[PDB]
Enzyme design. Sequence first.
Site, PDB file in Angstrom:
ATOM      1  N   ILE A   7       0.848  -1.189   0.123  1.00 32.18           N
ATOM      2  CA  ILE A   7      -0.067  -0.195   0.033  1.00 32.18           C
ATOM      3  C   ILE A   7       0.769   1.372  -0.130  1.00 32.18           C
ATOM      4  O   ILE A   7       0.600   2.115  -0.798  1.00 32.18           O
ATOM      5  CB  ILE A   7      -0.847   0.019   1.160  1.00 32.18           C
ATOM      6  CG1 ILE A   7      -1.874  -1.230   1.113  1.00 32.18           C
ATOM      7  CG2 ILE A   7      -1.718   1.423   1.247  1.00 32.18           C
ATOM      8  CD1 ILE A   7      -2.747  -1.168   2.450  1.00 32.18           C
ATOM      9  N   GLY A   8       1.923   1.119   0.834  1.00 30.33           N
ATOM     10  CA  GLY A   8       2.729   2.396   0.968  1.00 30.33           C
ATOM     11  C   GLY A   8       3.748   2.320   2.063  1.00 30.33           C
ATOM     12  O   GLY A   8       3.775   1.335   2.948  1.00 30.33           O
ATOM     13  N   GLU A   9       4.352   3.367   2.480  1.00 27.64           N
ATOM     14  CA  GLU A   9       4.983   3.536   3.660  1.00 27.64           C
ATOM     15  C   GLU A   9       4.457   4.184   4.614  1.00 27.64           C
ATOM     16  O   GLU A   9       4.028   5.472   4.452  1.00 27.64           O
ATOM     17  CB  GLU A   9       6.433   4.141   3.415  1.00 27.64           C
ATOM     18  CG  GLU A   9       7.370   3.370   2.289  1.00 27.64           C
ATOM     19  CD  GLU A   9       8.135   4.156   1.011  1.00 27.64           C
ATOM     20  OE1 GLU A   9       8.772   3.591   0.312  1.00 27.64           O
ATOM     21  OE2 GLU A   9       7.669   5.236   0.945  1.00 27.64           O
ATOM     22  N   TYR A  12       6.106   3.911  11.091  1.00 25.60           N
ATOM     23  CA  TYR A  12       6.984   2.788  11.447  1.00 25.60           C
ATOM     24  C   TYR A  12       7.257   1.749  10.455  1.00 25.60           C
ATOM     25  O   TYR A  12       8.015   0.692  11.046  1.00 25.60           O
ATOM     26  CB  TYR A  12       6.359   2.103  12.744  1.00 25.60           C
ATOM     27  CG  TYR A  12       6.086   3.392  13.705  1.00 25.60           C
ATOM     28  CD1 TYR A  12       7.153   4.266  14.271  1.00 25.60           C
ATOM     29  CD2 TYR A  12       4.770   3.689  14.035  1.00 25.60           C
ATOM     30  CE1 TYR A  12       6.765   5.052  15.085  1.00 25.60           C
ATOM     31  CE2 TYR A  12       4.419   4.769  15.035  1.00 25.60           C
ATOM     32  CZ  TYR A  12       5.572   5.405  15.541  1.00 25.60           C
ATOM     33  OH  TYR A  12       5.259   6.583  16.243  1.00 25.60           O
ATOM     34  N   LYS A  30       1.176  -4.437   8.708  1.00 26.36           N
ATOM     35  CA  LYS A  30       2.320  -3.570   9.038  1.00 26.36           C
ATOM     36  C   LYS A  30       3.585  -3.924   9.394  1.00 26.36           C
ATOM     37  O   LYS A  30       3.618  -4.961  10.439  1.00 26.36           O
ATOM     38  CB  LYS A  30       1.935  -2.381   9.704  1.00 26.36           C
ATOM     39  CG  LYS A  30       2.720  -1.348  10.168  1.00 26.36           C
ATOM     40  CD  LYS A  30       2.043  -0.278  11.141  1.00 26.36           C
ATOM     41  CE  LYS A  30       0.761   0.171  10.309  1.00 26.36           C
ATOM     42  NZ  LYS A  30       0.510   1.925  10.482  1.00 26.36           N
ATOM     43  N   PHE A  71      -8.517  -4.115   7.201  1.00 28.20           N
ATOM     44  CA  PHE A  71      -8.272  -3.232   6.444  1.00 28.20           C
ATOM     45  C   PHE A  71      -9.427  -2.129   6.154  1.00 28.20           C
ATOM     46  O   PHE A  71     -10.483  -2.591   6.130  1.00 28.20           O
ATOM     47  CB  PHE A  71      -8.078  -4.173   5.178  1.00 28.20           C
ATOM     48  CG  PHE A  71      -7.858  -3.500   3.794  1.00 28.20           C
ATOM     49  CD1 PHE A  71      -6.815  -3.212   3.432  1.00 28.20           C
ATOM     50  CD2 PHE A  71      -8.981  -3.294   2.688  1.00 28.20           C
ATOM     51  CE1 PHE A  71      -6.450  -2.284   2.341  1.00 28.20           C
ATOM     52  CE2 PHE A  71      -8.817  -2.611   1.743  1.00 28.20           C
ATOM     53  CZ  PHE A  71      -7.557  -2.047   1.494  1.00 28.20           C
ATOM     54  N   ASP A 116       0.460  10.998  17.496  1.00 25.96           N
ATOM     55  CA  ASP A 116       0.880  11.395  16.027  1.00 25.96           C
ATOM     56  C   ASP A 116      -0.443  11.321  15.226  1.00 25.96           C
ATOM     57  O   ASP A 116      -0.322  10.802  14.084  1.00 25.96           O
ATOM     58  CB  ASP A 116       2.095  10.479  15.649  1.00 25.96           C
ATOM     59  CG  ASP A 116       2.457  11.015  14.371  1.00 25.96           C
ATOM     60  OD1 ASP A 116       2.469  12.198  14.019  1.00 25.96           O
ATOM     61  OD2 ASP A 116       2.983  10.226  13.417  1.00 25.96           O
TER      62      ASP A 116
HETATM   63  C1  LIG Z   1       1.038   3.496   3.941  1.00 24.49           C
HETATM   64  C2  LIG Z   1       0.131   4.643   4.283  1.00 24.49           C
HETATM   65  C3  LIG Z   1       0.348   4.994   5.528  1.00 24.49           C
HETATM   66  C4  LIG Z   1      -1.721   4.122   4.231  1.00 24.49           C
HETATM   67  C5  LIG Z   1      -2.641   5.225   4.511  1.00 24.49           C
HETATM   68  O1  LIG Z   1      -2.522   5.980   3.637  1.00 24.49           O
HETATM   69  N1  LIG Z   1      -1.924   3.010   5.481  1.00 24.49           N
HETATM   70  C6  LIG Z   1      -2.880   2.236   5.632  1.00 24.49           C
HETATM   71  N2  LIG Z   1      -3.685   2.159   4.452  1.00 24.49           N
HETATM   72  C7  LIG Z   1      -4.822   1.596   4.623  1.00 24.49           C
HETATM   73  N3  LIG Z   1      -5.752   1.340   3.606  1.00 24.49           N
HETATM   74  C8  LIG Z   1      -5.427   2.153   2.395  1.00 24.49           C
HETATM   75  C9  LIG Z   1      -6.053   1.365   1.032  1.00 24.49           C
HETATM   76  C10 LIG Z   1      -5.833   2.429   0.015  1.00 24.49           C
HETATM   77  N4  LIG Z   1      -6.078   3.745   0.800  1.00 24.49           N
HETATM   78  S1  LIG Z   1      -5.626   5.013   0.051  1.00 24.49           S
HETATM   79  C11 LIG Z   1      -3.828   5.144   0.144  1.00 24.49           C
HETATM   80  O2  LIG Z   1      -5.897   5.080  -1.249  1.00 24.49           O
HETATM   81  O3  LIG Z   1      -6.231   6.273   1.060  1.00 24.49           O
HETATM   82  C12 LIG Z   1      -5.993   3.319   2.173  1.00 24.49           C
HETATM   83  C13 LIG Z   1      -5.191   0.744   5.765  1.00 24.49           C
HETATM   84  N5  LIG Z   1      -6.121  -0.041   6.046  1.00 24.49           N
HETATM   85  C14 LIG Z   1      -5.683  -0.476   7.493  1.00 24.49           C
HETATM   86  N6  LIG Z   1      -4.679   0.043   7.888  1.00 24.49           N
HETATM   87  C15 LIG Z   1      -3.966   0.064   9.268  1.00 24.49           C
HETATM   88  C16 LIG Z   1      -2.422  -0.521   8.946  1.00 24.49           C
HETATM   89  C17 LIG Z   1      -4.100   1.335  10.077  1.00 24.49           C
HETATM   90  C18 LIG Z   1      -4.239   0.789   6.532  1.00 24.49           C
HETATM   91  N7  LIG Z   1      -2.988   1.627   6.787  1.00 24.49           N
END
Ligand SMILES: CC(C)[C@H](CO)Nc1nc(N[C@H]2CCN(S(C)(=O)=O)C2)c2ncn(C(C)C)c2n1
Length: 277
Positions: A7-9, A12, A30, A71, A116
Amino acid sequence: MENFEKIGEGTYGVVYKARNKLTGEVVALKKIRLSTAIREISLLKELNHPNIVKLLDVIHTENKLYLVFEFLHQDLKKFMDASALTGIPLPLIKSYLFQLLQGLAFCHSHRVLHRDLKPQNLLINTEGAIKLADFGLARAFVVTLWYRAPEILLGCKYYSTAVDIWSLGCIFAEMVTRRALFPGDSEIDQLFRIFRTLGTPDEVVWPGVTSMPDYKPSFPKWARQDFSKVVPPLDEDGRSLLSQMLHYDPNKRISAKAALAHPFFQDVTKPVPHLRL
Ligand SMILES: CC(C)[C@H](CO)Nc1nc(N[C@H]2CCN(S(C)(=O)=O)C2)c2ncn(C(C)C)c2n1
């Protein structure tokens, strides 16, 4: 491979969308590439609330920590960008602020701080809910400074629940105006952006501020701006609540439980956002 897409960085580590082999469920994994943090993080599996992203499991393996979460399909930063031409409607901003305050009031009642908060850790779904991600991780363990409370920027090492109210106030203002409130690009630029809007703090509004570790008597002295200039076109109720969330003195800042009783929420509802996934 044993038990299960990027998904991305995150703050942590890297976050992945993954499918659990035993259940078929889609989860967010994560990976925190690295004992006290393990027990602390494991205790957050019990911090469950409808406005807190569920922490399903905490796995320590090959000298690495993996946190498995529920998710969600979009974060608030992406939803605000999708809504930049028209803005998020006031009833949905109100609903999201109310729900985030309920999530904070729950965690704060259990003495767990976030420390944060930022739009990237606020996740939304198609049913109108918004949830807080990463509570308790900062205590156990470019980073944006835009939402950091002034006591943190001034070097206080004793965090209170007030730091989370400040960050939520900043996020509230950004939902209304469609621009970040204090987009600093360094610690001093972050502080001076806060001081240019709210006035340079002094002993009158914040007792003890001049004795803070990073306070300098040489800071420039800016006068305070009215909130009618800062977050137009928010009504008087919303501006009053925002002003109580952005008080300099963390002792004076409104609590999440008191904010839930504010007159701004008298007509709160739960609209359903149209999301494009
Ligand atoms: C890498 C980022 C920090 C990102 C947030 O942009 N982390 C993230 N993303 C999740 N879902 C994404 C799926 C696509 N969208 S977006 C990028 O298009 O807005 C959100 C998500 N589901 C559950 N968790 C837990 C770990 C807290 C998540 N953590």
